């Protein structure tokens, strides 16, 4: 019913014969950080595959593509396929995974640099019930996986594209569907202000926007996301060449917000932060860090002045740890 055999190291080699000794309803296979079984060790169980739903294997590097072939060839039913950083996983097996079970709804194939395009076409054609998308710094995934991937199944809610080789020419097309909730465009190539405006206005129902480690975005794109982003609740600004004036802009023109992450910004204004401290009503996220340009009056006084701010600097994540 619930395997959760994660981090079993070298303890599970042939045992699975009695866990499913009579079993016909295993749906919670999580063997993450497996280091014991082999291709035989997965193929013995893969013979039956009774209605698997949450197949998952993180960093099972030693397992091969025959594992995915057998596990997708023997149960037409699947609900979660979040495999991990496991390498030497070609795209031929993913072809069969798309061909057999055309009902999968959630995927995660980060750190598998063998799925550049063919995996995208193959599980974009037949399978449609997909919901969540997350990938990692997997290059050679060209811009063909974005234009063509918003074409087929428009109900997807989570999208993950950090560190991939996709062009903005596909980012143009994500304004299609209005079901999307999360973006992970970390490491992208200069989405325009017009692009950000179109994707925000069409996709009114949007929750989380990533855009981490993007240099080329000016302050103006952030200046203008907030004028129309209503249900957006968190933005992840890291290493962007912003001028730290859109802070007051989002404190003026945006009221439905509680989480905002300013990453490695070279210039951080102190008075603008002072104004945002009392600008909004839902902001207590003062995880002050890398604070070379800070005084000893606000950070000394707001500790007792505002009992609704906890702070999380390296100075803070020691008392809490000592308490436990």
């Amino acid at each position: 019913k619930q395997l959760d055999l994660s981090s079993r190291q070298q303890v599970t080699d042939e045992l699975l014969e009695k866990i499913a000794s009579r079993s016909q309803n295993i749906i919670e296979i999580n063997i993450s950080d497996c280091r014991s079984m082999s291709d035989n060790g997965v193929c013995v169980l893969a013979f039956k595959c009774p209605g698997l739903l949450r197949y998952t294997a993180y960093r099972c590097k030693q397992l091969s593509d025959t594992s995915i072939i057998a596990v997708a060839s023997h149960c037409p039913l699947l609900q979660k396929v979040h495999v991990g950083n496991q390498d030497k996983l070609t795209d031929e097996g993913l072809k069969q995974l798309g061909s057999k079970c055309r009902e999968l709804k959630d995927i995660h194939f980060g750190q598998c640099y063998k799925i550049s395009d063919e995996g995208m076409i193959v599980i974009a054609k037949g399978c449609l019930k997909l919901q969540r998308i997350y990938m990692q710094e997997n290059k050679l995934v060209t811009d063909q996986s974005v234009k063509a991937f918003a074409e087929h199944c428009p109900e997807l809610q989570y999208v993950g594209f950090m560190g991939c080789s996709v062009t903005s020419k596909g980012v143009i097309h994500l304004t299609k569907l209005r079901n999307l909730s999360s973006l992970d465009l970390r490491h992208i190539t200069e989405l325009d202000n017009e692009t950000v405006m179109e994707i925000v206005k069409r996709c009114k129902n949007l929750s989380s926007l990533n855009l981490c480690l993007n240099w080329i975005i000016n302050d103006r794109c952030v200046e203008v996301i907030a004028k129309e982003g209503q249900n957006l609740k968190e933005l992840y600004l890291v290493s962007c060449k912003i001028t730290d004036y859109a802070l007051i802009a989002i404190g003026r023109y945006s009221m439905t917000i509680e989480t905002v992450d300013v990453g490695w910004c070279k210039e951080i204004t102190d008075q603008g932060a002072t104004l945002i401290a009392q600008s909004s009503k839902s902001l207590r996220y003062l995880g002050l860090m890398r604070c070379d340009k800070v005084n000893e009056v606000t950070v000394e006084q707001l500790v007792q002045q505002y009992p609704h701010i906890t702070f999380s600097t390296v100075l803070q994540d020691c008392k809490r740890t000592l308490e436990r």
Partner: protein, 102 residues
């Protein structure tokens, strides 16, 4: 503070109460959440997007374990230790571990 830095340093070298786990070549460093955020912008990119209690990170095959080992002590102690055999891969003083533009 300074003694705060040392206390965090020891707690790291207790193998207890460690948040972020770095996975390089099977080897697993265990360090905190805030410190690696202070160290290299590459890591703080991959952390702050999650509030999960337990985290996992892998690094590119280009970054070598031999040069990787001293970096953690660098981050924790803010101290410089070097040998003439192992310099080229760290030849920017932004420590330039392979890819690795901050």
């Amino acid at each position: 503070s300074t003694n705060v830095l040392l206390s965090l340093n020891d707690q790291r070298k207790k193998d207890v109460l460690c948040d972020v786990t770095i996975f390089v070549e099977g080897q697993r460093f265990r360090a905190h959440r805030s410190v690696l955020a202070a160290c290299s912008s590459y890591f703080h990119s991959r952390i702050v997007g999650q509030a999960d209690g337990e985290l996992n990170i892998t690094l590119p095959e280009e970054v070598t374990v031999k040069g990787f080992e001293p970096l953690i002590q660098f981050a924790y102690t803010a101290k410089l230790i070097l040998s003439k055999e192992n310099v080229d891969e760290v030849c920017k003083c932004v420590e330039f571990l392979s890819v690795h533009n901050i």
